[PDB]
Amino acid sequence: ADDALAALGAQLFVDPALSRNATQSCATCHDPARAFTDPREGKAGLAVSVGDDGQSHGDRNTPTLGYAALVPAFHRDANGKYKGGQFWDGRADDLKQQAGQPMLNPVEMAMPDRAAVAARLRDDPAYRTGFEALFGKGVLDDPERAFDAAAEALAAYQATGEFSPFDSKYDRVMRGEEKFTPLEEFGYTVFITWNCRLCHMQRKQGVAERETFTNFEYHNIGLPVNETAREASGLGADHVDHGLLARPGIEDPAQSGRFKVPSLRNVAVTGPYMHNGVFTDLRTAILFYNKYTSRRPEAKINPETGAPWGEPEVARNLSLAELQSGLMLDDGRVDALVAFLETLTDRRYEPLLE
């Protein structure tokens, strides 16, 4: 497996032959030049991605694959909190369970079934050689096995150092190799003393080994519907995206509206933000939190629209205990948080920061 398995996934990852009309690969929506996110503009801007048929839009924003391999498999912890998994609603248990889904999703790569996927793999002599070396002769003639093998290779590739290099400025500073600027240093201090650290840090306490700025939990922070993305997805004006409650086997109405806490690594280059891409600018994402703490008029207004944020899509189960922190971020602290979050950019994306 190991090395050879991930090298097979690497080939699969950039291959548009895994989409029905051969227009798209994993890398089309998870573009490695943009921290594994989608630079393409469909009908709702960059908020949601367009599938292989050139017309079907998703209803959620394409997340980075960087650091996804550090997320635990989906589970309920003893304290009753669900954690880990893949997708914004945790409905995949892990990377391996996730990987096959875009291939068969009619709104994404739109392969009709596993048989059609295996037929595509068989067509390419390099896949016959590489899959057979790892999984045995005839693997590609068996659509169940061929499909599972492809998923295994993709997950193995995503678990390589390429996706999770830990070489951001933040990492360099934690290694003692250089210092934060005073503004970054102030941002780090705010981040670790304000409510951000209650969700966007691996651990409740102690020191994390490979910090990825998420506790992998599920929270409803009370986001409004993204009207233009929702129109484009075609799910309908009456649709409600129930987040984690939509995972099969979750039935607890307290999970309605909750989404996985995203890793903030590379956040400065993976706009627009939130599970539905509703805010284009990182400063707006941070200012969103002040709606729960500031009584000033401007706190009620999305600076990108000049209009009120909007009612939450799901106005129940909001994490008010964490969000109603009693303290508002002034512009100085918002500026410092932006500078801090930019230090979470992998070295290879630093040139994108202007």
């Binding site: 500073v173 934690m174 290694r175 003692g176 201090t189 705010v190 670790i192 003393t193 304000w194 409510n195 650290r197 209650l198 840090m201 409740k204 306490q205 102690g206 020191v207 205990a321 964490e322 109603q324 922190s325 009693g326 303290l327």
Partner: protein, 125 residues
């Protein structure tokens, strides 16, 4: 004992004011009224605000960021009072200032001070 001498941290007793994690505590140690080093006593409400300090651990020779949090909604415990100020800055640098009652965020809008916990939140660097 000499109050003005440089503070000497130890890693052997959390109820004493020279325990290493209490290097910028102000108030009372929660372990002394039914909480623990990092948990609040029953009946009190755990705030989400904190002031932070870099505290030297004499055991491993490393410094750790302690983000002090208050347990709120009860009169001051009166047991194990301590006031240390390692790296403590005046009120216009609130993130490092410890005369402030850091009860913001506590359930039920609790803002009276009972005691402080001393959890680690990161390595200092």
């Amino acid at each position: 004992t000499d109050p003005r001498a440089k503070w000497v941290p130890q890693d052997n007793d959390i109820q004493a004011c020279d325990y290493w994690r209490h290097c910028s505590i102000d108030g009372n140690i929660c372990d002394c009224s039914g909480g623990s080093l990092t948990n609040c006593p029953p009946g009190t409400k755990l705030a989400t605000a904190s002031w932070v300090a870099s505290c030297y651990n004499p055991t491993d020779g490393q410094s750790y960021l302690i983000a002090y949090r208050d347990c709120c909604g009860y009169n001051v415990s009166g047991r194990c009072p301590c006031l240390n100020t390692e790296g403590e800055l005046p009120v216009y640098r609130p993130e490092f200032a410890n005369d402030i009652i850091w009860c913001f965020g506590a359930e039920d809008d609790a803002m009276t001070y009972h005691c402080t916990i001393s959890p680690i939140v990161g390595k200092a660097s």
